[PDB]
């Protein structure tokens, strides 16, 4: 029967206007004080998933 | 190791705070220094531990 | 037996010498 | 024994070089612990905090030689 979405994936990706997926950056959850301010300021904006890893997200979310 | 972590509360009524580190073994004196406050868009004094 | 291991043999030679240190001076 | 262990890359080497396009602000010569193996000279100031160099304007990379006691001084032909 129907393919099931890997629900962990559903909560960590979201398709855009041209079949990308974007994902929130790592290193933005704790131990922040020892990190440089600049780094954190460059981690907030969303970023599109890598070319080499895209096929996995493609294969995990049929109903994306 | 030994060196402690500390809040930096604004004197301004806004809840903004920086974060910092200093020893208890070395200098007892509590910190005083002004820094920019984005919610106020103005430099304001900062202090306090905890 | 011989086996070819190094520490498995020097123990034996150590016993063989350790007895001779007594038996000589006696 | 126990004399193993090792560091990794820390890539430190010239990259933008010679007739490099010198576009905008490329890191021509990225050597770590530098500011000695090469130097500022041309329209670029370079001098990253870790002595990384970079162009400040479009132009050719140069590699010169200047003041007393020789030295290197990377610069940029303007254009």
């Amino acid at each position: 029967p129907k393919i099931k979405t890997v629900r962990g994936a559903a909560k960590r990706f979201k398709k855009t206007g041209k079949g990308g997926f974007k994902h929130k950056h790592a290193n933005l959850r704790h131990i922040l004080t020892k990190k440089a301010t600049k780094r954190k300021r460059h981690l907030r904006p969303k970023a599109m998933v890598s070319k080499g890893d895209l096929g996995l997200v493609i294969a995990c979310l049929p109903y994306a | 190791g030994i060196r402690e972590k500390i809040k930096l509360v604004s004197s301004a009524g806004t809840g903004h705070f920086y974060t910092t580190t200093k020893n208890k073994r070395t200098k007892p004196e509590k910190l005083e220094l002004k820094k920019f406050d984005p919610v106020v868009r103005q430099h304001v004094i900062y202090k306090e531990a905890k | 037996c011989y086996g070819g291991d190094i520490s498995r043999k020097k123990k034996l030679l150590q016993k063989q010498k350790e007895g001779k240190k007594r038996m000589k001076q006696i | 024994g126990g004399s193993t262990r090792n560091g990794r890359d820390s890539e430190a080497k010239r990259l933008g070089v010679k007739r490099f396009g010198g576009e905008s602000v490329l890191a021509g010569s990225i050597i770590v612990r530098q500011r000695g193996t090469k130097f500022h000279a041309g329209a670029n100031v370079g001098c990253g905090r870790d002595h990384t160099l970079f162009a400040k304007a479009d132009g050719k990379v140069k590699f010169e030689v200047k003041g007393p006691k020789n030295r290197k001084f990377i610069s940029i032909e303007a254009e």
Partner: protein, 96 residues
């Protein structure tokens, strides 16, 4: 999603979710429609009887998808400025 014992790509990356619930009941129309609404008066329903929206929906918006020619009375819909001028181009009534 497996890839050796290495921690998987849909696990290294932190969650940012939050379903809106409300979003489920806000369909949007396009100008190419409501020439087919028939009867000359658009509503949160009517189109719902024209099956160009769906049944559950409450809120709806017009949006300039382009091309409207015959006059039409927009009514009870929120609408984008471009769509507003667009309906004005039809001479369309725009009441709240």
């Amino acid at each position: 999603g497996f890839e050796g014992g290495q921690m998987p790509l849909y696990r290294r990356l932190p969650k940012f979710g939050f379903t809106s619930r409300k979003a489920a009941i806000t369909a949007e129309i396009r100008l190419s429609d409501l020439a087919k609404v028939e009867g000359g008066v658009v509503d949160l329903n009517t189109l719902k009887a024209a099956n160009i929206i769906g049944i559950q929906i409450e809120f709806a918006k017009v949006i300039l998808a382009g091309e409207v020619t015959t006059p039409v009375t927009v009514r009870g819909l929120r609408v984008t400025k471009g769509a507003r001028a667009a309906i004005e181009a039809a001479g369309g009534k725009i009441e709240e």
